[PDB]
Amino acid sequence: LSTMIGKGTGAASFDEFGNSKYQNRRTMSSSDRAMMNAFKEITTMADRINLPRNIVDRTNNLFKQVYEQKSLKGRANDAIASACLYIACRQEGVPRTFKEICAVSRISKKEIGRCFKLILKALETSVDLITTGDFMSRFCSNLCLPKQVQMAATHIARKAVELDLVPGRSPISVAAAAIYMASQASAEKRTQKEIGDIAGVADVTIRQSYRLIYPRAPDLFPTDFKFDTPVDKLPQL
């Protein structure tokens, strides 16, 4: 719309008797002032996990579409905003887990997820299916694992899903157990608890998934890898 005013020159600017120099400013866009507040939350959240502005811009854009449709007006903006961040991140080929978006949002994992399915129907659109490769990077990097371990981990993950060794499992858990296997075969051994703490998965979820992949451990590693410990000497949990 328009302009604003403030200050006073420090000269006349009456409050005459009371203390109100000339006149206070006025609000102008209250009807949509909660769209701008949605954008403020989207940017804040986004910076907590340090996305580039390009993701944030698509997230901002997805919201404006959902808002104008008014089809989801009944739910909290912070729920709808959190879903936009989740959709946008997945469409841009760098998926984040619901556990991750919940951590930065004030909305619970359940409500972000429910909103997410509803928005997909709302925008009459669909999204790509996540794969294990999409998280392998972030996890191995945060645990200060050498590039070589990450490469093996990717291979192990990839090969395992190709072999259908894990019929009904989240890609995150499979990734987490693969990383654990790789790391326990590496010099930089990390505990189950640390990985579980990063991936969000329970350490028992890792324990099962590791138990299920362990019987075929020899066949899954890439030929280039050089063991620190023999596989006949890789511990069980």
Binding site: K99, E100, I101, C102, A103, K109, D197, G200
Partner: protein, 88 residues
């Protein structure tokens, strides 16, 4: 930059509290609720509706429905309102 649960730990505490008895209210028995209004009128001539729902533990739409039936209202300044059981 912190682990990601399913929700805030405390949020779950908040859920648990909400999930303990209190939630729905006891709209039944108008007379006891009538007595409670009379009891309010035993302490002071007027109260804030926010206080009236707190002291009665009843839904606002209903407490209004009753206050329309047996009483009146009186506001002051900037929509600051108090209700009274028609003192005479």
């Amino acid at each position: 930059t912190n682990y990601k649960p399913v929700a805030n730990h405390q949020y779950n505490i908040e859920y648990e509290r909400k999930k303990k008895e209190d939630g729905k209210r006891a709209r039944a028995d108008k007379q006891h609720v009538l007595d409670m209004l009379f009891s309010a009128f035993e302490k002071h001539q007027y109260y804030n509706l926010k206080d009236l729902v707190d002291i009665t533990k009843q839904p606002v739409v209903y407490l209004k429905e009753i206050l329309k039936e047996i009483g009146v209202q009186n506001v002051k300044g900037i929509h600051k309102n108090t209700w009274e059981l028609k003192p005479e």
